[PDB]
Amino acid sequence: DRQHVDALVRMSNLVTPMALRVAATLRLVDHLRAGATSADALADATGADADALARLMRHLAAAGVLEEPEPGHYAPTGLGDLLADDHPSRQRSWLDLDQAVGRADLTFLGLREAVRTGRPQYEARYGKPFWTDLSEDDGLGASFDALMTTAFAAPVAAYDWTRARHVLDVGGAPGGLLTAILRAAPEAHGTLLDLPGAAARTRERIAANGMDERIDVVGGDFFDELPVTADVVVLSFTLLNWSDPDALRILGRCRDALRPGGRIVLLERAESDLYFSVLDMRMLVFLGGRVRTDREWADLAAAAGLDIVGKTGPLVVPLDSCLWELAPR
Amino acid sequence: DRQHVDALVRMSNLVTPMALRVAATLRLVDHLRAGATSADALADATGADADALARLMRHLAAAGVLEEPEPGHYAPTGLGDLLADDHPSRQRSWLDLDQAVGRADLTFLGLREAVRTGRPQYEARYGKPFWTDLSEDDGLGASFDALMTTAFAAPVAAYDWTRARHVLDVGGAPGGLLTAILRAAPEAHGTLLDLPGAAARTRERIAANGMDERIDVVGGDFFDELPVTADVVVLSFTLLNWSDPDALRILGRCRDALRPGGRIVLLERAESDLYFSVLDMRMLVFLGGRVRTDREWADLAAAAGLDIVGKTGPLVVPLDSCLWELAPR
Ligand SMILES: Nc1ncnc2c1ncn2[C@@H]1O[C@H](CSCC[C@H](N)C(=O)O)[C@@H](O)[C@H]1O
Ligand SMILES: Nc1ncnc2c1ncn2[C@@H]1O[C@H](CSCC[C@H](N)C(=O)O)[C@@H](O)[C@H]1O
Structure with a gap:
């Protein structure tokens, strides 16, 4: 069925959730808002690869997070503005791979082994279990505590x-x-x-x-x-x-x-079931x-x-x- | 903005795309259709952990892929029926982590390094680059060829x-x-x-x-x-x-x-831009x-x-x- 297939394919998308986390980690939207809107300018600001950044921003534009006001120059949409570091949603920090939640979310890569064993897979990825890692890394622990106050x-x-x-x-x-x-x-x-x-x-x-x-x-x-x-x-x-x-x-x-x-x-x-189930799955996989x-x-x-x-x-x-x-x- | 935040959070979801791939790999929907509908029966059929399987199926039910006709017993919805191995969409094989496409899609875990370097990250994960892996593994290569005929x-x-x-x-x-x-x-x-x-x-x-x-x-x-x-x-x-x-x-x-x-x-x-951009991102990350x-x-x-x-x-x-x-x- 055409409707079902299109729904399953949308639900299967790993590219966009990863693209959002990479963009958050690079402070991409902050750089765009500061005028570093070309892939070359963004590469200079982040240290990342200009061609790969161009392809990342093409994808985020196709997903409605960015727009392209000039050829080769990107800017956030109203949706993308949530990734500004000072936005009250704090979504940049929720998604940042160098803070505790984005870092932990990557352990869903190991969901197959979590389902096979019933054991969390954060230690398999990072070498320490979740709470031990946040204890030993002041930046990670403090980032978790700051996010969980909200x-x-x-x-x-x-x-x-x-x-x-x-x-x-x-x-x-x-x-x-x-x-x-x-x-x-x-x-x-x-x-x-x-x-x-x-x-x-x-x-x-x-x-x-x-x-x-x-x-x-x-x-x-x-x-x-x-x-x-x-x-x-x-x-x-x-x-x-x-x-x-x-x-x-x-x-x-x-x-x-x-x-x-x-x-x-x-x-x-x-x-409501979906929200509670996502929390449960975080518990299975890393908490x-x-x-x-x-x-x-x-x-x-x-x-x-x-x-x-x-x-x-x-x-x-x-x-x-x-x-x-x-x-x- | 409430609408924007809800949209970004939906777009950030890594749990459901991973849950679909794990379910496909376990032949979960085929087992349910055969009457192995409890977590205990599914654990016996797959070798996976019964408690973790129950939590996986709770999530897939919350996502509309499964329903729970009896307490502790799950069955596919019309959407979930696409994961039956004989369904003409072949979605089970597109998502199967033991076939070439699901296996490759997990490399999107390494999108940060693909964007930093511009280099594909499949060899980093699996020890051989994509085409070499499919050549050396008859099962992987044949699975790719079978899917790409459609x-x-x-x-x-x-x-x-x-x-x-x-x-x-x-x-x-x-x-x-x-x-x-x-x-x-x-x-x-x-x-x-x-x-x-x-x-x-x-x-x-x-x-x-x-x-x-x-x-x-x-x-x-x-x-x-x-x-x-x-x-x-x-x-x-x-x-x-x-x-x-x-x-x-x-x-x-x-x-x-x-x-x-x-x-x-x-x-x-x-x-249309989104479809072509997903293809481009597969090229960046593993093809x-x-x-x-x-x-x-x-x-x-x-x-x-x-x-x-x-x-x-x-x-x-x-x-x-x-x-x-x-x-x-
Ligand atoms: N083995 C261990 N020994 C002591 N504390 C531990 C521990 N493993 C985890 N923890 C701590 O358990 C806490 C759980 S989160 C903090 C809970 C706190 N009581 C509250 O009300 O919010 C973390 O601070 C974590 O560092
Ligand atoms: N280093 C290499 N030497 C020879 N073949 C290679 C190679 N690296 C990749 N390939 C092959 O390149 C092909 C690309 S896909 C196959 C393309 C085919 N000509 C067609 O029209 O569909 C694969 O069969 C892969 O095994």
Whole structure:
């Protein structure tokens, strides 16, 4: 069928999504807006090949991203203007192959192996798994944090944080949630554990915010014994990026760190199809893990020797969240 | 702007084009049509991971390729039925990562390096350049030839082949054009040169067609001295996949092989934007070369010590062709 074939071919297009990411990485639209509109001028500005750049811009013009106001000279359309570095959509940074999201999206090249094995393929491409790479590379981690900002009031209200004297945030970088908890709970002291590079950036952030007397930052690995005990151990959007066997290892380390009467608190994603499926596929291919159902959290808790003693949610940012309270059996 | 942002994000989608290729490679829709419709049944049939397959099919359902008639059981939509192996669109084979086109399309992962260097990136990924890989791998070469079939009457009529006693087809696999020329020219004998693996497949084809007394097949490299002299040396859709420096090397070998009075004959692509640009981008990234203008062919001929003594075209299959006659100066 002609309509079906044309639809499938449009849906199969790898050239345009790659062309957009290369253009973003080259700051192509910024150069065009500055008057470097020929392939030769763009080659001088970027270091790339003039003939190949001409062919790239021909393609982006055919896709409606650019126009050709003079022979051999390109300029952004209204659509292409979204790739300007200062555009409020930040689409240039979402697509930039030298920032964390564009870099990670290239791992979809390895989708066949992700589907064969069920394992993420970012480490296969880059030599370190995703969170470790962003920790060890200040530029990558900071770029991810900047994009993902675009007040933690709901989780601060959803739990009585004034009853917790010592709080340990496991995988807590960049420290926004723990900072909000402690500003609402004067009697609480915090410890934040994350990988060493991410922890160092968080330590600098906390000091610049005047919270270094309220929060100790520790660089380390949450698959290892945790560095302190605590009355509440917080896992905020951490377990969702791990398999059930790995999440059980993390929960075990957290349960071992509980003081008498202590609790583990999960802040997690709550349990249109296309948007949610793209997020799920990013989890399969490079972020790790999956979004669990309420039943799956109960099963995970039981396998960790934990009772679910409370759930508060949905907490309503495009996605909703849930706060879970877990206690040792 | 909301409309622009939504358009750019749709255009940026790498998940769906990769999901389609993985599904094609797994023969997923064929398995569903055979009743293996759960992730567990599909894992048994394919060897892939059941949980990852479930997430793949969720995505393809969200994209309109599949539906979920029973909980946990998927089936193709009318769109998805195009991925059945026996569908006349052959879209499963166009997308199959174990056939030549899907395998090559993954090289668009390396578009950044193609744009930086101007060089194709297939050899970087697979260890051999495209035509060499298809020559050395009978399955890949045969899959490409089968897809690209979907009578050579125009080029046979466009030149007086009855005046050529000895014809050499340089890069002539799979041999269709030379076979058509010789069936129209009783006084002509042919020699066909291609890489050894492609030449062996062509030799078998020619023998099965009863043309082995009319055509000698030689395995070799057209950057080397050619194996025979000839009255007409034919380059049919060969020079377009090479840079000007490489095309000049090939033209030099061809000019050296001309008998007195001999001619070189080019059958080439003639000089909607989106379709042609995708073809151009495939040339940049893995096929090699570019489509030249009439002016560029004249410049190439002059740099090779050749006069253009005739052009016959356009010859009208979606694309048009041109026949060029070249003579030593
Ligand atoms: N093995 C490990 N040990 C400690 N932290 C880890 C880790 N693997 C991943 N992480 C950290 O897990 C965090 C997940 S994203 C940050 C979640 C944060 N608690 C929030 O609410 O937003 C990252 O900061 C990452 O560096
Ligand atoms: N170095 C080389 N030496 C000989 N043949 C080569 C070669 N590099 C590529 N080729 C061959 O060039 C051909 C280009 S496609 C085949 C073109 C054919 N003449 C036609 O009309 O359809 C392929 O068969 C490929 O194997």
